[PDB]
Scaffold this active site. Sequence first.
Site: not given
Ligand SMILES: Cc1cc2nc3c(=O)[nH]c(=O)nc-3n(C[C@H](O)[C@H](O)[C@H](O)COP(=O)(O)OP(=O)(O)OC[C@H]3O[C@@H](n4cnc5c(N)ncnc54)[C@H](O)[C@@H]3O)c2cc1C
Ligand SMILES: Cc1cc2nc3c(=O)[nH]c(=O)nc-3n(C[C@H](O)[C@H](O)[C@H](O)COP(=O)(O)O)c2cc1C
Length: 635
Positions: A397, A588, A633, A635
Amino acid sequence: SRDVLSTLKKNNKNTLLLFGSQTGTAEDYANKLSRELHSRFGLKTMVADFADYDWDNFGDITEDILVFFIVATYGEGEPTDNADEFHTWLTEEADTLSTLRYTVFGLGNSTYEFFNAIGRKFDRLLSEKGGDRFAEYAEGDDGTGTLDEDFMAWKDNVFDALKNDLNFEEKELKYEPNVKLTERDDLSAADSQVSLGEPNKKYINSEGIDLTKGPFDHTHPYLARITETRELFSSKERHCIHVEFDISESNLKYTTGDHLAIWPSNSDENIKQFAKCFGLEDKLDTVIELKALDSTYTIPFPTPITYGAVIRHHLEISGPVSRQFFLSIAGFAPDEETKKTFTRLGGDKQEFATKVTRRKFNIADALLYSSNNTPWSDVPFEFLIENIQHLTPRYYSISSSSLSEKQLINVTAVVEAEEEADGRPVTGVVTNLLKNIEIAQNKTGEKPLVHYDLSGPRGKFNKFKLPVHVRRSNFKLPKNSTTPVILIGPGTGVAPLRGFVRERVQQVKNGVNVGKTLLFYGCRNSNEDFLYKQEWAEYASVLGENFEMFNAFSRQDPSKKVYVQDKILENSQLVHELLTEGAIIYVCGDASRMARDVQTTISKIVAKSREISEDKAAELVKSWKVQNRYQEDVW
Ligand SMILES: Cc1cc2nc3c(=O)[nH]c(=O)nc-3n(C[C@H](O)[C@H](O)[C@H](O)COP(=O)(O)OP(=O)(O)OC[C@H]3O[C@@H](n4cnc5c(N)ncnc54)[C@H](O)[C@@H]3O)c2cc1C
Ligand SMILES: Cc1cc2nc3c(=O)[nH]c(=O)nc-3n(C[C@H](O)[C@H](O)[C@H](O)COP(=O)(O)O)c2cc1C
């Protein structure tokens, strides 16, 4: 080439698999199912992105094509961006599908209200319009961590259906490569044609091209220079990074409330364990060229390329290990003691969960556990390229205002890292990259848990650049400046709300007439993890009586938790007053608990304030969500 029926005929294909994916999981499953369908049943499979075809003729599809829909649900029961145009056609333009043979697996998360809306809708609409459902609908719960076993059980039932209802001969799974690898000893990093892990082929040549003019999307990032980072928490063990990207020398544009996609590279620690696991530690500078063996297989990165560039910049090597991965690679087990352990782990759902999933092993640690540290030498790297998902971008975000700073993008990323009792680091790929950039940029003196390559391919990430693109959201401040807004976002939920508050501040500064802005924030401790603590007073002093902030310090008192919902209840008469003036609600942050707690609280205030039952108020709040009067918003 946009006609999917033509494309099926031209490539002699009888099985379409369509993926509706935002962060790649649906894509990966389409891909896994494709290969297993082809190997075990001899079907001629083609994996298609919804976005790569037009669907105006899809009702023309003939009974000899088995169609598989692997579709995730996003937003408020919205389709994935790739599937949106297919979602429009089915719901609005599609007449009949009289000879469609289909089946559907939906990916969702039950902490969200519209659970697997898109899976269910599609499975229903396709049947209503005359489709033949050859295998029962199923769906995955990412909320409970069962998604991967959910997909596996569905696939088993789809194999039952094919073998026992469509009367298909089932052969054992065997690796049938869709791609051929050739080592080029005649090629080295010296050769400019060779990828050292650049984001795409337009970044590999690129002498007479401007890489600062877009358009930028999931296929083509901008290399954005991080001009500033700071640690926002005071705790030694927990971290949150404020990131400033400079986009001033580019055509990259964002609107307040949009998402930034950050393209990752893997950690040194992770790459080492991978290369060890498969005995590639002497091969990481060896160049390979990939040649497709199937007419519909796209090679997923630039070729030619080094082994090390594939692993560092293109393969999701970290993350939970699918049990399906164990079943696909078991054939390549180094010795017979490994094979015995590995087929037993791969065959037992509960024992796999206890010994692989719950220990948080990466692929590398799981195979090395199984083989007692024997390298998996016989695994063709081609198998790895097909059976490990593309390294996908993480969404943030945007916490900056496009009115206040059109030329900067802020994000606010809390760092996810733990250290196992055995000493293994479990790390968020993108967040530890950002912690690393922060440590290095500010010469802080912290010791990184994991390290990354901050110069990137041929030093093209130098000046602490990452590849990013912007994804437009529906998460928008009201069209009318005067409409009051209620902003709720504890922890990093504050990120986009900072964006909103910064926009309205610049609007007041611009002599514009701005509605009441109510912000509910939460954090553990005003001394520990209060994000942007000093800015809010400054924003208050400009917004005057048109801004009020309520802060829930959840650990300030050790005996009693205090959350945003508590601060909402005690300011309920203000909240309801603002709702009577058409206030837009913005929630959010944490999807799994806070979002639902807050939704209940708002329902309770509606119920009392308008003298209706709690369930009638809950239905009224749910309809605000469908109308975009209540925006999330989370996640
Ligand atoms: C619409 C949206 C908005 C977002 N906004 C924000 C935001 O503003 N700020 C924010 O901080 N995040 C935000 N997020 C979350 C963000 O996208 C990431 O998911 C988050 O920052 C972690 O990503 P990463 O790549 O650091 O961890 P990833 O690489 O995706 O790992 C996910 C988690 O799994 C763990 N992991 C690693 N290896 C393993 C394993 N082998 N088994 C199990 N677990 C494991 C990691 O430690 C971590 O905790 C948002 C997500 C969405 C979808
Ligand atoms: C921002 C966000 C909004 C979501 N909204 C919904 C939802 O409205 N309904 C639902 O069933 N799952 C929801 N999910 C869960 C996703 O459908 C799920 O994480 C999915 O396994 C991701 O698939 P993809 O990696 O193929 O996009 C949401 C996930 C995220 C990150």
